[PDB]
Amino acid sequence: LVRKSYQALALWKLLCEHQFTIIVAELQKELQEQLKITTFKDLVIRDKELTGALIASLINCYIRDNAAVDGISLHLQDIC
Amino acid sequence: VFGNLHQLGGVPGTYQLVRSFLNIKLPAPLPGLQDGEVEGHPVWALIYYCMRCGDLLAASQVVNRAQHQLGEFKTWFQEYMNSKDRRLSPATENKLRLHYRRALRNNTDPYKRAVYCIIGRCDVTDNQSEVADKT
């Protein structure tokens, strides 16, 4: 559990760096209601598919810069 | 640039087109690493690419606005630009070269090195480490 929380927080550390907000607005669809009422514990005990899609968008789009991007790709590979 | 996005948020100016290339194109998978960045923008990379495009004047302007502290270089950029681009001052060129060797050569941000080396013709042994990406 502690490691898992570490991972979620790590992703968020990533997101803070930049252009997270714009993607969020554009991305959210029908699933969106579920997304918005997601608690931290929900991430702690993960809801894997949505994050994977979002992360993919972070990488596909320009937002992630340099080293960050490499890290998600690593992440998707490792736990995705 | 001519294909979706934002459509870039701002005007179609050449500078912004290059910012887009640098930002959207592959400088970031999901952004990061070893550039000098102010307000979300790699200035040196920008100058390098603008220069690459042939937009020397714009590159010069970027440097002017830059917030940097190698400022002597700033001087040497502008006159390189002013002339036929073979900026040959009977004066300083020598001085620029020494600084490159001592300070810049063993260190720095790849793009910064590129700009110095290319503009200066600083070190004739030739090749730019990190950012030669195409033939």
UniProtKB/Swiss-Prot annotation, chain A:
PTM note: Phosphorylated. Phosphorylation and dephosphorylation may be important for the function of NUP155 and may play a role in the reversible disassembly of the nuclear pore complex during mitosis.
Top-rank lineage group of the source organism: Eukaryota
Entry's localization field: Nucleus, Nuclear pore complex; Nucleus membrane
Secretion signal, residue range per the UniProt entry: none
Tissue: Expressed in all tissues tested, including heart, brain, placenta, lung, liver, skeletal muscle, kidney and pancreas.
Family: Belongs to the non-repetitive/WGA-negative nucleoporin family.
Linked pathology: Atrial fibrillation, familial, 15: A familial form of atrial fibrillation, a common sustained cardiac rhythm disturbance. Atrial fibrillation is characterized by disorganized atrial electrical activity and ineffective atrial contraction promoting blood stasis in the atria and reduces ventricular filling. It can result in palpitations, syncope, thromboembolic stroke, and congestive heart failure.
Function of the molecule: Essential component of nuclear pore complex. Could be essessential for embryogenesis. Nucleoporins may be involved both in binding and translocating proteins during nucleocytoplasmic transport.
Quaternary structure, from the entry: Interacts with GLE1. Able to form a heterotrimer with GLE1 and NUP42 in vitro. Forms a complex with NUP35, NUP93, NUP205 and lamin B.
Name of the protein in question: Nuclear pore complex protein Nup155
Native species: Homo sapiens
Gene: NUP155
Complete-protein stretch covered: 784 to 863 of 1391
Swiss-Prot record, chain B:
Source domain of life: Eukaryota
Localization, UniProt: Nucleus membrane; Nucleus, Nuclear pore complex; Nucleus envelope
Effect on the protein upon substituting R113W: In NPHS12; doesnt affect nuclear envelope localization; impairs nuclear pore complex assembly; doesn't abrogate interaction with NUP205; doesn't affect SMAD4 interaction; doesn't affect IPO7 interaction; impairs SMAD4 protein import into nucleus; impairs SMAD4 protein signal transduction
Disease cited in the entry: Nephrotic syndrome 12: A form of nephrotic syndrome, a renal disease clinically characterized by severe proteinuria, resulting in complications such as hypoalbuminemia, hyperlipidemia and edema. Kidney biopsies show non-specific histologic changes such as focal segmental glomerulosclerosis and diffuse mesangial proliferation. Some affected individuals have an inherited steroid-resistant form and progress to end-stage renal failure. NPHS12 inheritance is autosomal recessive.
Complex formation: Part of the nuclear pore complex (NPC). Component of the p62 complex, a complex composed of NUP62 and NUP54. Forms a complex with NUP35, NUP155, NUP205 and lamin B; the interaction with NUP35 is direct. Does not interact with TPR. Interacts with SMAD4 and IPO7; translocates SMAD4 to the nucleus through the NPC upon BMP7 stimulation resulting in activation of SMAD4 signaling. (Microbial infection) Interacts with SARS-CoV translation inhibitor nsp1; this interaction may disrupt nuclear pore function.
Role noted for this protein: Plays a role in the nuclear pore complex (NPC) assembly and/or maintenance. May anchor nucleoporins, but not NUP153 and TPR, to the NPC. During renal development, regulates podocyte migration and proliferation through SMAD4 signaling.
Record family assignment: Belongs to the nucleoporin interacting component (NIC) family.
The protein's name: Nuclear pore complex protein Nup93
